[model samples]
Target: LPYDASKWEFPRDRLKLGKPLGRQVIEADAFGIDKTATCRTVAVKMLTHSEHRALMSELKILIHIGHHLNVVNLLGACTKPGGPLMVIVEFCKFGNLSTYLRSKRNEFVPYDFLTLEHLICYSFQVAKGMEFLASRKCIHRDLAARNILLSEKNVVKICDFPLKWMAPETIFDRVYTIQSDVWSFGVLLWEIFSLGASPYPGVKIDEEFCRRLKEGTRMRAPDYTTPEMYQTMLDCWHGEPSQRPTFSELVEHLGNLLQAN
Candidate 1:
């Protein structure tokens, strides 16, 4: 797998920006043609001089990990000495998955259409994406429902999170690894199965919460989660990071579930 570093750098002139997404970002096209001919849209994220240094780490990770079918793909970047440094990533039209799930739930959609199996499929997609990242030896420290995005086709893409989703080691010692992401993946499973329910409904991050986690207490299984599925999420929450199954194994389990019935 050879990579040309120059290809990751996008010419500023080629990006034609469009409607602003609040302050930090705006819609964009490759000279107004990429979307027309390629049927694609991208988000150009702007970074001030003050913020660029910190965020460059994320940019490096995106470039290093290459691309995944179920993860946000970086198009390229435009960085010229002094002004704002810009990054272009594929735009997800359906937007944040957490919000999307909540919206569908609010609509009172029947189980006939938006079934538990459908949610399981989304889970499998995410697991496969994580497996890809794991293969690259990259750790997505922030993995949560809010960080995930949904494309026009309702694809589940892992994005970036904090606090309640942290693994025990990360919360206490600030250690981060692929397994930390695994722990967060468990919480993410809760969100997907619960139809975007936020984890820890009545609790905040504090001594009691930490104590409970250390004591091996876990969240109740979400609605529609079979015993086997709930056990899978529990598998991710194992205290020792190494004890948690690899994403490859997770992908295997979910794939089996989908194929079983």
Candidate 2:
């Protein structure tokens, strides 16, 4: 239920701003009875009047979708009719997937670094989350390593939103669909295999390249990428959206890869 406006007040004092989680900042706070309270940090996004309504819309959609292992779980929101409306979500300790992967790369101890198996497992987790979203008719417009988050237990959670990593159709026609998410997922796979290297390596992604993307120009497989895995990545970048594999299919294929390796 939407928080009853008359009953609960926005616990603004309980939250203290912490680190930045993308454009929005995070806040460390706790809720519930004082006797058995728990520390639960939240990602806080400030919204304008109209933006508050938009945030509420996304909240409504999320309420129906419920919870999933690989998707970030929404805690609640502060919709007081005043300054900035606040949207709160669970905090991921390790932050974005790209940053975490890069940090792992810098680790000198081989055992501490991410192995090929770890990378595949993370991809599999992301695919499973997408499968759930697809079933619910929700398209994560932005699907990229940067949007994916990491928790303390090696958990990967998909964050919904976008600025980049959009499918060609989304870029050109402003059309967003599950297949578009699959295309972005392919780029995410590339990031995983490359251990956090940016997509399109040397090229600056401009309007021209986005146009080129629709014309069948796709990122080449990163070095050391397996033929089978690279083939899966290509399948996601199919020029025809219908040609892309569904998240359910991607999950199955990822399972097979895990078994093969």
| Top TM-score hit | 1
lDDT of 2 by residue, 1-261 (tens): 465544333466666667665655556564641224766666776555587677777766666677898998766666665555666676788889998887777652312567767888899999999999988888887788988999867899998644347787887788898998898999899988877888887877788888788787878888646778899999998988999999999999999997777
What TM-score does structure 1 among the candidates reach? 0.87
Task: List RMSD in Å for every model shown.
Answer: 3.1, 3.6
The runs of at least 3 residues in candidate 2 whose Cα sits more than 4 Å from the true structure, single-residue gaps closed, are 1-24, 33-36, 80-84, 108-111, 162-164, 204-215
Worst 10 residues of 2 by lDDT: 27-36
Per-residue alpha-carbon lDDT of model 1 for 86-163, expressed as tens digits? 777878887777887887775433242567667878889999999998888778887887778888665778763168
RMSD in angstroms between candidate 1 and the native structure over all alpha carbons: 3.1
**lDDT of residue 155 for candidate 1:** 79
Residue pairs clashing in model 1 are none
Q: Estimate each model's TM-score.
A: 0.87, 0.82
Measured on C-alpha atoms, candidate 1 has an lDDT of 0.79
